[PDB]
Ligand binder design. Sequence first.
Ligand SMILES: *C(=O)C[C@@H](NC(=O)OC1CCCC1)c1ccccc1
Ligand SMILES: O=C1C[C@@H](c2ccccc2)N1C(=O)OC1CCCC1
Ligand SMILES: [Cl-]
Ligand SMILES: [Cl-]
Length: 180
Amino acid sequence: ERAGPVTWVMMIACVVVFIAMQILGDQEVMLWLAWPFDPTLKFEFWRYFTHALMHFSLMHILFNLLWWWYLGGAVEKRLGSGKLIVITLISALLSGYVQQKFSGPWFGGLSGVVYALMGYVWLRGERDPQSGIYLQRGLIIFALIWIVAGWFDLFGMSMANGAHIAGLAVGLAMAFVDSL
Ligand SMILES: *C(=O)C[C@@H](NC(=O)OC1CCCC1)c1ccccc1
Ligand SMILES: O=C1C[C@@H](c2ccccc2)N1C(=O)OC1CCCC1
Ligand SMILES: [Cl-]
Ligand SMILES: [Cl-]
């Protein structure tokens, strides 16, 4: 029993980066991995994605990776690595875009991506049971509680509601496309 290669490599990468952040401090790692925060950086193309790899607390990374492991892992197993890769790239790009637009380039984390995955697995199951992909009732509840936590700032997070929504929109859009 094991998480697929994308699911696994993403978790490893997040952990390595989290470690780098402990050794060097958050700021220094952000200096290299954050969304372009200066026009002289706009052509360092890894930055449009690598912001998703940074986490700022234990909770952040523990919870993001837990949801990534479960939702990302299920999508990878049942729908393929390619599917997970595309959901990840698109949600990371759009949620990052929306985030920097409203609040500037200093942010990070897999939240945009897990919102997408959450939206994807849920809607897919709603519209296409026979797909084998669905979000259990109990998990819908826990997902909702964390959405509330982020919406009303019960727990301080890196990204704002807008970027979380942008992540969700991506997942819903792809599930919708997929269930035609
Ligand atoms: C990202 O939004 C950070 C939070 N993760 C999250 O809320 O994900 C839920 C689970 C399914 C999608 C919404 C977060 C949670 C706990 C601690 C810190 C950050
Ligand atoms: O988020 C989530 C899903 C739920 C959960 C359920 C079982 C194991 C781990 C996580 N959860 C969460 O926030 O649960 C809290 C209550 C008990 C563990 C932490
Ligand atoms: Cl595993
Ligand atoms: Cl966040």
